Design a protein around this ligand. Structure first.
Ligand code: FBP
Ligand code: MG
Ligand code: MG
Ligand code: MG
Length: 221
């Protein structure tokens, strides 16, 4: 039996992609960069804050100092944070609160393995903090594309190996990260996106304890 579930945040617990998009678009427009549209935001799925900014600058072949780069990232984050101030418990994705309750009821550890430094704030806004035995801090581990480090950190923060854990993710890069950690991925979304040889559910209403248990047993030799 798995000992922990490692939760992604965006696309699993809730999704703030619309606010990330609007904050990036506002930053781009402020510096005279056109072309940050909704489809462009698709290109940022599984992409870090810094790598996202770099893609936007690349749109306009815009060159900046390392220091200016840091300031631009901070600017976007400030705007993003303003926008997520209105997140509430009503923004919790379907099935997620019940899953957290069922995991807690069965003494299965719950860890956050979000790439976002805004994870703790978002859990507080959703009244979910106390369900989480640990929050892995993305500032303290690798943020490169598909890096397993956040999932490894999340498992370790609740006293388990990734091999004893399930990881939930909405992005191709995050699924890859989970695989590389040694945890068992269960993706939410479309296979065309998430990849092959994993269990994929179409929406979070399918993330039930019963289903996670069935999948675990299917994937054990
Ligand atoms: O891994 P999650 O919870 O889906 O969060 C993904 C988000 O994390 C980031 O990589 C970093 O988020 P922050 O800018 O809030 O620190 C975003 O670019 C991305 O949209
Ligand atoms: Mg996500
Ligand atoms: Mg993630
Ligand atoms: Mg269904």
């Amino acid at each position: 039996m798995f000992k922990a579930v490692l939760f992604d945040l965006n696309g699993v617990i809730t999704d703030t992609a619309e606010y990330h998009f609007r904050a990036w678009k506002a930053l781009a427009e402020e510096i005279g960069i056109n072309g940050v549209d909704r489809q462009f935001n698709e290109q940022l799925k599984g992409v870090s804050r810094e790598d996202s900014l770099q893609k936007i600058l690349d749109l306009a072949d815009k060159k900046v100092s390392a220091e200016e780069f840091k300031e631009l990232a901070k600017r976007k984050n400030d705007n993003y944070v303003k926008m997520i101030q209105d997140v509430s418990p009503a923004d919790v994705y379907p099935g997620i609160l019940q899953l957290l309750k069922d995991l807690r009821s069965n003494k299965i550890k719950i860890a956050l393995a979000s790439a976002s430094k805004n994870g703790p704030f978002l859990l507080e806004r959703m009244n979910l903090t106390g369900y989480f035995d640990a929050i892995a801090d993305p500032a303290e581990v690798a943020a490169s594309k598909a890096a397993p480090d956040i999932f490894i950190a999340a498992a370790h923060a609740v006293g388990v190996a990734p091999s004893e854990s399930i990881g939930l993710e909405d992005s191709q890069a995050g699924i890859q990260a989970i695989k590389d950690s040694g945890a068992l991925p269960i993706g939410v979304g479309r296979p065309e996106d998430l990849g092959d040889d994993i269990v994929i559910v179409p929406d979070t209403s399918h993330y039930t304890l019963e289903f996670l248990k069935e999948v675990w047993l299917q994937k054990q030799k």
